Design a protein around this ligand. Structure first.
Ligand SMILES: *[C@@H]1O[C@H](CO)[C@@H](O[C@@H]2O[C@H](CO)[C@@H](O[C@@H]3O[C@H](CO)[C@@H](O)[C@H](O)[C@H]3NC(C)=O)[C@H](O)[C@H]2NC(C)=O)[C@H](O)[C@H]1NC(C)=O
Ligand SMILES: *[C@@H]1O[C@H](CO)[C@@H](O)[C@H](O)[C@H]1NC(C)=O
Lengths: 96, 93
């Protein structure tokens, strides 16, 4: 019986979340990609291997491969935008 | 063979590419073609003087092609563009 009390609000909040998801899709469509090393901007330059320095020390390098990765919570489409906005509304990981 | 601490081959010329440089890119691949014409003149240079040591071309793209072919020598941090012999021929004091 309690559950039916919010038959209206629970609809308007879903509608607003959908609208904000669409706006976020328009704003951040595909802009969350990045390369493994923070020196290559294009996906064409993010290929092969690169030298990574552990803990910022220039004397301790390691060889790693660079991958053009995408953010786990992106805005590529409407479903991903809804998932990201839900995580934001839960107030967890929203600063990142 | 002798007069060389390692195993070599006079059939062609080895190519060294730095770790931080991706082979197969358009810049590298184009440089990797027209430098293949150096193999014949590498052999021609060595025919008159069989006592000739490493002959190397250090390109501005990063790759170094040397003759005779021999394997490269822990991670690799060699860049031909930072070598003292490359730097003096790049500019003046
Ligand atoms: C850059 O790469 C190109 C392709 O990998 C090379 O171009 C090819 O060179 C071949 C041999 O030099 C050519 O083969 C012969 O070319 C002559 C013309 O000079 C003709 O008799 C025939 O086209 C051919 N003969 C055969 C196959 O019996 C290729 O035609 C030529 N082009 C291709 C394969 O598209 C370039 O030489 C190379 N650049 C450098 C500097 O080495
Ligand atoms: C190379 O140098 C030697 C002297 O060291 C000289 O006799 C010779 O003519 C030169 N040229 C060739 C092709 O050997």
């Amino acid at each position: 019986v309690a559950i039916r009390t919010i038959g209206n609000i629970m609809i308007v909040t879903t509608l607003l979340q959908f609208m904000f998801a669409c706006i976020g899709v328009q704003l951040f469509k595909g802009k969350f990609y990045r390369c493994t090393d923070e020196a290559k901007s294009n996906p064409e330059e993010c290929r092969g291997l690169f030298i990574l320095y552990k803990d910022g020390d220039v004397d301790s390098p390691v060889v790693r491969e660079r991958i053009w990765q995408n953010s786990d919570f992106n805005f590529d489409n409407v479903l991903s935008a809804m998932m990201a906005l839900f995580t934001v509304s839960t107030f967890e990981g929203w600063p990142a | 063979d002798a007069n060389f601490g390692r195993q070599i081959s006079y059939q062609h010329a080895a190519v060294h590419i730095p770790t931080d440089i991706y082979e197969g890119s358009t810049i590298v691949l184009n440089e990797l073609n027209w430098t293949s014409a150096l193999d014949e003149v590498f052999k021609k240079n060595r025919e008159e003087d069989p006592s000739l040591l490493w002959q190397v071309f250090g390109s501005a793209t990063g790759l170094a092609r040397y003759y005779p072919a021999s394997p490269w020598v822990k991670i690799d941090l060699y860049d031909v563009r930072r070598r003292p012999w490359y730097i003096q021929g790049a500019a003046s004091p």
